């Protein structure tokens, strides 16, 4: 009941996912167990933990697919646009991990979880590989070593997707 928030319990994965992708087409035609109506539905549906979990899943899935595409496609002689997007994405992830460190029940409670350890290894691997590439972007050997580190990055990203 806490998971689904102010939503009905008969809602399926596909219904909430479809409502997430189509906000203005699925929310009026839904049951929730104008200024007074639309704002209330938007504030109730997207504050639910289930919706946040689905958003985090989809986000991590895109991260895995986009990062997988980035490591399969060849690196360019300068820092590419997809590399900058992934850089912004992993700083964001690092800040989210720091926020989790501050608001947990101690450093020990956060480091006990295996997914937090996977998150730290993930962020660390990406930054080594990126700085390895960014030190000399036109160097072929730097690109090869960077992709070698980023192979380990992709396996952990997909292992971290099992959460």
């Amino acid at each position: 009941a806490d998971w689904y928030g102010h939503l009905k319990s008969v809602t399926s994965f596909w219904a909430v996912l479809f409502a997430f992708f189509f906000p203005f087409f699925v929310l009026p035609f839904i049951n929730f167990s104008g200024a007074h109506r639309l704002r209330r539905k938007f504030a109730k549906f997207y504050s639910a933990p289930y919706t946040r979990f689905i958003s985090d899943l989809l986000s991590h899935f895109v991260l895995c697919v986009v990062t997988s595409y980035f490591v399969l496609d060849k690196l360019e002689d300068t820092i590419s646009a997809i590399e900058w997007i992934l850089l912004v994405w992993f700083v964001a992830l690092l800040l989210e991990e720091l926020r989790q460190m501050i608001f947990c029940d101690g450093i020990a409670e956060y480091i006990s979880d295996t997914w937090n350890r996977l998150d730290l290894i993930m962020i660390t691997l990406f930054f080594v590989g990126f700085f390895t590439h960014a030190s000399d972007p036109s160097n072929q050997d730097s690109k090869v070593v960077s992709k070698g580190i980023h192979a380990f990055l992709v396996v952990v990203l997909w292992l971290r997707f099992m959460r």
Partner: protein, 96 residues
């Protein structure tokens, strides 16, 4: 974990992060806002308290009844009753 996490996904969570930092800066330094919550009335608290005590007594009565319907307890009860029955017959024979 997902109750306290911001809703905005991973790339776009930087906006949520700077918004939370803005709220902390505006509450520590600026002090233009505070935190608001809701406190339960005494009527619903005593209703929950009354409900919990009634169900505690109800469970103990059901638990006591269930433990008395077990085979071991019934055999033990039967044994003690027959022993007390002979005590009563020791009184019959004495009087006779």
């Amino acid at each position: 974990e997902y109750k306290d996490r911001p809703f905005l996904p991973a790339p776009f969570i930087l906006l949520a992060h700077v918004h939370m930092l803005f709220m902390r800066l505006l509450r520590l330094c600026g002090v233009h806002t505070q935190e608001h919550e809701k406190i339960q009335d005494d009527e619903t608290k005593r209703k929950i308290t009354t409900f919990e005590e009634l169900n505690t007594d109800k469970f103990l009565r059901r638990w006591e009844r269930e433990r008395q319907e077990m085979l071991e307890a019934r055999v033990k009860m039967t044994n003690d009753n027959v022993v007390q029955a002979m005590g009563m017959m020791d009184q019959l024979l004495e009087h006779m």
